[PDB]
Amino acid sequence: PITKEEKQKVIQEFARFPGDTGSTEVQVALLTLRINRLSEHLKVHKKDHHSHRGLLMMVGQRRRLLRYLQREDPERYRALIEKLGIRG
Amino acid sequence: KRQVASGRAYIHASYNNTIVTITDPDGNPITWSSGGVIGYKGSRKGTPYAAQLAALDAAKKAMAYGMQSVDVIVRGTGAGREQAIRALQASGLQVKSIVDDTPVPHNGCRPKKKFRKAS
Amino acid sequence: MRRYEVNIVLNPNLDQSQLALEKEIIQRALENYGARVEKVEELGLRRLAYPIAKDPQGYFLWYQVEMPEDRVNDLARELRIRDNVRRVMVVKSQEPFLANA
Amino acid sequence: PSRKAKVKATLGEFDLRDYRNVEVLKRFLSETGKILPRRRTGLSGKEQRILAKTIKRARILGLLPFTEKLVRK
RNA sequence: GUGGGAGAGGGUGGUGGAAUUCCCGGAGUAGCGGUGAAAUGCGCAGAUACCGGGAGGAACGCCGAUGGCGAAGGCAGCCACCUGGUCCACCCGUGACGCUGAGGCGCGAAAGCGUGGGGAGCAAACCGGAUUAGAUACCCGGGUAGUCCACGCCCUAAACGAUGCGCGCUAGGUCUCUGGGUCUCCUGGGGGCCGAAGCUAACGCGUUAAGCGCGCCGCCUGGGGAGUACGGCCGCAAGGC
Ligand SMILES: CC(=O)c1cccc(N[C@H]2[C@H](N)[C@@](NC(=O)N(C)C)([C@H](C)O)[C@@](C)(O)[C@@]2(O)COC(=O)c2c(C)cccc2O)c1
Ligand SMILES: [Mg+2]
Ligand SMILES: [Mg+2]
Ligand SMILES: [Mg+2]
Ligand SMILES: [Mg+2]
Ligand SMILES: [Mg+2]
Ligand SMILES: [Mg+2]
Ligand SMILES: [Mg+2]
Ligand SMILES: [Mg+2]
Ligand SMILES: [Mg+2]
Ligand SMILES: [Mg+2]
Ligand SMILES: [Mg+2]
């Protein structure tokens, strides 16, 4: 599981400013976190199809948020990805 | 011919025939009887009357080993389970106690079609 | 680390030595598996509802720990190894749910 | 009718999560190692729901029975 | 985001007792079984009924529901780990980032297929008993594939609510599961029944719409011929589209 610390850590880590609990960055941040965890979980339990969907959707919601960002402010976009390590 | 005095009476009923087995204080059988043991052949074997006559024989034969007090145990349900118990009750043996020990699965083996259709 | 509750019912025939000996192995392994005993209740013997290993009684130990969940299972694989250990059970600690109260 | 008092009424403050109070759990099993129906246990969907588990733990541990023989008949 | 909640949601390992079958030991005879009757069948190399021990596979009584969870197929012993969805409160953060979705990709009961493993019970085919005018069936005794696990494949279904998804709007009453509250009631999510308005060919539906509206998808156009033929795509095959 992602410890509360694990979480907030990443939050403050991206927040656009003190108190930013849900900018597009924070969200892409956290989503990326959950994904990688889950994705890891699935390297094993390749038969846990039911959890796959969760992933399928998290990926969706993320790539859909980034779209919005890229479209809005292309600069922040680059910054976020390069940082996070998305794409490829 | 050992002289047990007090023992156990196992009544195994089914809709196909009943069968009483008189045992001793720790389980080992002294005498046994069934509807088949008595005259009754096929269908007739089930009948509660048979139960009675098998129940008696079961005890009468038990009396030989000097039986007197017995504990009844009932496995099953069917064409004359009670009768057997009642038959014993009189017989000439003191029925210390009766008990339903009929076995039941906590769902293990798919029964033959014969007994499925339910759920 | 998460908080648990180990349950151990071992042979009710161990003599003062043999018995406090298995506790040794327990207490020992407990540690080896990050088990940090928060407390314990040793009810001792109790009339088992049904025979456990032909024996109709049992010796009950109760150790509430705090350990690395990533190894809770292994902690018991070990605990079970013992021959006198006839029952092991690690329960997730839980807030006592009261009722009719 | 089934009205012979609720196994809940004849009782006090007990932690339904206590898989070791043989004293009290023993109260919810029938004349067999069977878990009494709510209509007798007098518990609630949620309570009767936990009791269940708690009783099953007891059985495993070896404290509570899985099934008793029936007397009389 | 923070703080909470319920749950047979899923994946791995572990493990508990009941029962059947088999093997061993004890005690114990003449039967057992089975049916409308029977027979086959099993039993004196000793069966059945009873007791003690062992081995193995499979399923998980009570709780259990009129219940719950899931997108669907589906999901019930207990335990730990890994993990998905979802609801409530606070109204804290982003600031239209939304809906639908041809193609794609993934999932997808049962049966079925390939390799290996397993095999207690059940049981297509089959081998027998019976019933019948006949019995390639219905009843009875056996029993192989299979049913189980792994990995790969198939992808169908009364895959049903026979009811595509999302949002807004339109009397109530009652039972119920779960969350909050100022908790003999209010409020939110979910499951049922009755019913306003309205809708419907009728039956019925009726804030869980089949009502009133907007958006996007899929689909229909008399019956048989026919889910057939041809062609193409997929599949090891069966077969699918
Ligand atoms: C007395 C009885 O039940 C009986 C007697 C002779 C023959 C039979 N044939 C029976 C026959 N044993 C039957 N199965 C059976 O034993 N059952 C547990 C129902 C067949 C072999 O599958 C049957 C279904 O054809 C049957 O039950 C129907 O027969 C009659 O209803 C029937 C009757 C009632 C009278 C005359 C001819 C008949 O076909 C039964
Ligand atoms: Mg969860
Ligand atoms: Mg705000
Ligand atoms: Mg602003
Ligand atoms: Mg299959
Ligand atoms: Mg196969
Ligand atoms: Mg069979
Ligand atoms: Mg057959
Ligand atoms: Mg399939
Ligand atoms: Mg509602
Ligand atoms: Mg009207
Ligand atoms: Mg209605």
Ligand SMILES: [Mg+2]
């Ligand atoms: Mg035409």
Ligand SMILES: [Mg+2]
């Ligand atoms: Mg081809």
